[PDB]
Amino acid sequence: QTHGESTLSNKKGAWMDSTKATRYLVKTESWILRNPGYALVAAVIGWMLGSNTMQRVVFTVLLLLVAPAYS
Amino acid sequence: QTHGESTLSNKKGAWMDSTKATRYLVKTESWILRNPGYALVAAVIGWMLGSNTMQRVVFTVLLLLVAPAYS
Amino acid sequence: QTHGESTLSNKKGAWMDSTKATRYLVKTESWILRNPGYALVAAVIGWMLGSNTMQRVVFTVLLLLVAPAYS
Amino acid sequence: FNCLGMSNRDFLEGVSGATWVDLVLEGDSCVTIMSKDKPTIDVRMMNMEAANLAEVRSYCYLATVSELSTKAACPTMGEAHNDKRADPSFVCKQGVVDRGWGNGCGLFGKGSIDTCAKFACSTKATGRTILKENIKYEVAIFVHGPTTVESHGNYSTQTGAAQAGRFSITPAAPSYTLKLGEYGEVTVDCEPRSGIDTSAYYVMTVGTKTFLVHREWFMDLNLPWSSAESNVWRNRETLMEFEEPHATKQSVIALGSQEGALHQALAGAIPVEFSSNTVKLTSGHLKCRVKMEKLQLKGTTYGVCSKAFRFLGTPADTGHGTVVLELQYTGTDGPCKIPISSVASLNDLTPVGRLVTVNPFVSVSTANAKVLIELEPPFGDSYIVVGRGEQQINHHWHKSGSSIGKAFTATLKGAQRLAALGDTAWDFGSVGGVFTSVGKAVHQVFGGAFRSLFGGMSWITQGLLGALLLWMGINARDRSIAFTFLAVGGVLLFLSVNVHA
Amino acid sequence: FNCLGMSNRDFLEGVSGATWVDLVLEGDSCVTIMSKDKPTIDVRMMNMEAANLAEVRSYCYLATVSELSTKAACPTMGEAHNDKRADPSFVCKQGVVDRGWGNGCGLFGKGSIDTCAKFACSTKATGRTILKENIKYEVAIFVHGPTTVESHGNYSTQTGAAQAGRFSITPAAPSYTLKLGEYGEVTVDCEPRSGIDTSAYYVMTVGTKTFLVHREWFMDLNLPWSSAESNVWRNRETLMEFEEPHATKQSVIALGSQEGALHQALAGAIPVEFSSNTVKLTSGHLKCRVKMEKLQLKGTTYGVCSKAFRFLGTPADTGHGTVVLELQYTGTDGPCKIPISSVASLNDLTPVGRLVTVNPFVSVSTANAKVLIELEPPFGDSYIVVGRGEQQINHHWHKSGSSIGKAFTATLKGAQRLAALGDTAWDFGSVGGVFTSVGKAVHQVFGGAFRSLFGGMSWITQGLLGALLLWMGINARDRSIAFTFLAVGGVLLFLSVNVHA
């Protein structure tokens, strides 16, 4: 569990601000790269579960985000 | 990213096999306890997104899983 | 938690066979006798919860048994 | 070692041609096997002893608490930790207490305290397991030969006469051929490894009294427990009471002796004898097969006694449908067979009752020779005739009951044996029939599910569920589920009433 | 100290009817207060310093394992328990291992194993709490007087000239009156106990560097921890690995140093300075009320300088719309005021821009006296005119931007301050208006609800949820729920983008 953005009105830099954008993305990126076959599974399951276009898109995004970060 | 289950057909234990159950759940459970108020948000968003009970349940579960593990 | 009837196919008496009939009744009898007002509550709830005479009787008996042995 | 004088007694009539019969030797019971042209034998297991018991877990029911020490902490400073937070001989607990400027603190609030006490057990209840290789049943076989009142129950006299024998049935020697004087040999092929399910019990010792308790019940005792090889204690907070959270000294006292609560919790447990690491128990069963192909009559080459007999005392009904009496031979004819029979009238003189003591004879050659004879008179009025002519002595006997009541008692005892033994009850008096095997298989299949469904229920819950299921089946619409509920409720009600509670 | 040369600088205007101003002094930020006929002052908090830190909990990230011992147990027996389990500072674990006649056992199955090892921590990360009575802020007030480029940042010169002062703001002394000779005096009423919520942070020292971490995050670390002033470690099984069950000797090794894993976990933590059990923090905020009624303008009794001035360099823009330039006065007229002004053209000559250095004057009486002056020219082309007549010097200046762009930057900075301070941002620049109080109360309730709902999220979760809520709002039939979802999605997207990641 990472610390995350502090609440102490900091106009300066935190401990690791260089990785502040990629810290919550490197795992998902490296997982989807080596495991590209899931992108089709998530798309199919989202298309078959959503009755609307918005529902299908949200299902696909949620599945493609939950698979790398297993919980 | 953690190594995960190997594919060598091993009958003994892996490196960290005692934590094989709570390996991917310690972060999510600890995040839920600190932030109970999100469970209401995920529930209402899933309810307002899904048109069927199955869609509502799946939306709620996917949101409640994707919030702790931000990726 | 008491031991209960053994499975050894015994023909003599167990350790406490004289209390074999009153071991599971001394608590309920003494409880019903020290507050008979619950018997009205159990009867009313069983009558207002069951649609048939059998359902009312079973509800009444189950409540009047659950109250003394709180577990 | 024999059946005379026992409330539990079974009679099995051996079919002519069959050389063996399957027995289920229950503890404190007795099986009398009668054949057409063979002597009568009594078979019963006297006990089942098992030495070299292994300790599995020891519970403490009397603990000692001393060396009280409390470590207090200020509010919003985290839970306190005492100096004696170590593993050995110390149990600790976290509590909150009011702190302030009066208590010597800096802030006001519920300050955290951590008090520890020295745990020391005084008397423990050791549980031991039974190794299936150390079990040995003690089976006794007695042959109905020439005995008296004082000699029928004397084991030394019956072994000197080679009419009885006590022997051990171990897994390494499940078969024993008991040699007799002139009655031949009796061979039993028992099943000691599967007789008593020792893999489901523990030998629990609470003080001086020892019990045979279930395994799952012994492991669910909410009490401080340790292992065999002088282990440390665990779950020790159940015998310790932290009275009231105090700032400087929270008092900790140990509860009273839990020996009474143990004896009160061992309600349905079975008391056993335990000494020298050996457990002995009289209850239980032992499925055995008695082979009687080499069992012969003694005294068939003798002649009928010519002199007159006399009734010493009155015949007695043993309660199992048989009658035991005493005769005193007045002659010195030596070894001679007794002309005793059970007739319906004194003008027919046709044998109507079956003798239990097959081929009775006067063994000794003295003047007055007492002899114990057991008969099975017919229901109603009958006579016990000894001799004929002028030497004839008669004794009227009335046997109450009837053949219908006998069948009712027989089916009641069969249902009780089926409830007490389960699938093993089908192998009682079994000669290997096709109906027996099918019945035993169906009983296994049904009893597995029945135990899985209603295993740990008392006679009250069983009776209530039986009544409820009968009511559901009576008010049921489908004829299948109705009869299913009827059968299950009947079995449950029988099991509830069978406890006699 | 001073606002010159700081990217974070805000300008507050003094109301003619208000005697005090309310401002939130953020760390690494500076506030410039410009009032009419009053000297300009720079109020800036330097740091928050809290001594006498109380230790709370020390996590271990580098343990040592030695003195290994293993005890086995036969199957169908009790669990194994090692004798070192009684000794403290030993971590034991139970497991199963194959046993048989080859392992010296008596039965075949999964025998119980019990391995223990001595746990010894090498380096630990101590977490300390901040007592709200020991906190003290260092606030610096600087009045814009006669300064040079060198002496502007020199605190010794500004203190000797009585134009600046660093003072400590403690809860026991929340107010301070800074005597500025001939400039009057300024009083600040600050809220030290409510400035930085020290009750929500721990001071965690990981090796040689110290961080300011959340309390909820610090108490969720899965590492061997010990309480304050205690050597007994708990949760020691994390830094130990039991490799593989073995009957005679199971190998136990300690994991590597978790110092890197801690640094990776302290991603958003704020690094602080920790020395002599005292933490120094240059971040945070401090709400203060600046009293400026007794603040008088110095140099109002001086005459205008009669000799010629010169620009010591090209005037420089500061990025905040202001311009700083250094003049040099040739004459020796003693203390004289500088006739500098910003005009829109060299033929109008009427002042159009505001001077930040109000009433600038030459302090010393010697020749070649350098004076630093800060102005605020209007947007567009203007001229910085110094003097009049034949000695008039001027410098053309172009100010890029407009009042609309300035308003957009101002509202963006206000939104960022509202996102960074919460309800405290409504107290910035406030003079006690009824609108500010209502806004602060509404923001209090809405922010409480918003934090209770969407607290603990990262910028990715916040952004995704805001996009989803916007998509749900634009597709909503009702009007109220649609506007609510739009507002929540907008504020979530703003909080996601405000992180700049």
Next chain:
Amino acid sequence: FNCLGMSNRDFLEGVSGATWVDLVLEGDSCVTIMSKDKPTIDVRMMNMEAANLAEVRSYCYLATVSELSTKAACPTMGEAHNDKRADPSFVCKQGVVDRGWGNGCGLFGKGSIDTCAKFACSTKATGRTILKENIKYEVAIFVHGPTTVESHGNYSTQTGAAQAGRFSITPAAPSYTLKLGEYGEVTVDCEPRSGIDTSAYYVMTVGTKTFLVHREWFMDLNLPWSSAESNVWRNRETLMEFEEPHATKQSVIALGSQEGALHQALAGAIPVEFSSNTVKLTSGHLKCRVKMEKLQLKGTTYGVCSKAFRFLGTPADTGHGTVVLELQYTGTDGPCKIPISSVASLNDLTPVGRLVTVNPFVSVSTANAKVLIELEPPFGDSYIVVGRGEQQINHHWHKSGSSIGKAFTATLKGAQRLAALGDTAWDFGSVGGVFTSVGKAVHQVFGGAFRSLFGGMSWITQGLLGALLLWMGINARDRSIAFTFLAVGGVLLFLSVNVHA
């Protein structure tokens, strides 16, 4: 070595007339082949050892930062460039800092800086690839002959008796013919080149421990890495943290040791032995074919013994349905068969249970000869009769379980083998056949698709996805897609539960 005492033991009964059988020798597992008229053999791979490991990539988890230097530039001098950009082993980062007349600049703005620091690695995590021409599986073959309890697991004794032997299986020598004393010869045509996929694993050494990591997981590691036998470190910014940008000197510190973070990342890796540049793996599988043409049964010409036996200790259930016991011959006949059998009763004496130690005999000619015999009794009650007549010894044995439970356990173990081996599981116990080949091909294509779809998932994601697919299948209108979803969800749930986590 042998199968006795192994928790993972499978029995394969070859059909009559079969000369070979395909095996899949798994690590820590043992397969026992029982063929009619042939001696029983035990085949198992002990360890896979690969030497001459080639290094591929070396990560750094403990770095050192030194030689700090910072080059600053004014807001209008462009970007700052430090003279350490041309020096390798120096990591540089460009940043911005607020500059002004106080810092030593001439303008105000975000001045560019370029801080460099020397990167030096102190401890590395070296990964090494496995060359397929250097692997060698150690296989052990043991034939069930005359052994004792003490000498059953003694490899030296079993080789002196020519009843066992360890040998290597190399890709250069994929076949080995083990020559037994009088049991003939056994040969194994193993496939070591396709046993363990070495092209998908690296041998990573993290400090004192060594692992067998995935090839793709090792390359995706975010740490400073250098190629084989090279000091050029890349991706060095991960172990270095650049602190708050300062004008004259920006601090750069190296993160803590990432050894513990690596041990946590190696959660599912397989620990291996590593010494002298070779690696030993006890886990893995090896598809092999055991040919038993020259395998002959020893002792078929001996005469049946005449003296009496005795049971030394109690028989023990091995846990796989078989029962091992030790006899002791009391005669000196020499090489003589043993008349041991598993019968249901002492009346019929018909063999109901088979012998694992086929054709047992007393080898030595001494007086007291201990013999270890392993039987396979039937379910329920049975007897282990040794000899006939007045010298026979009986031992009762009850085998708990049923033939249906055996079928369920066999199906579960087959499913687990199919999940752990994939298409290789069809080669287990295969003597050819059209069903096996088509099944293996269908499993190949289905497993390829299944891995390409759900390859890198954990048991949690697999379980959730399987539950979702089952819920979609039970609510699917079309029967085809419903069956597909049900099958995929069942496979996913089985794989999620098979890990027992």
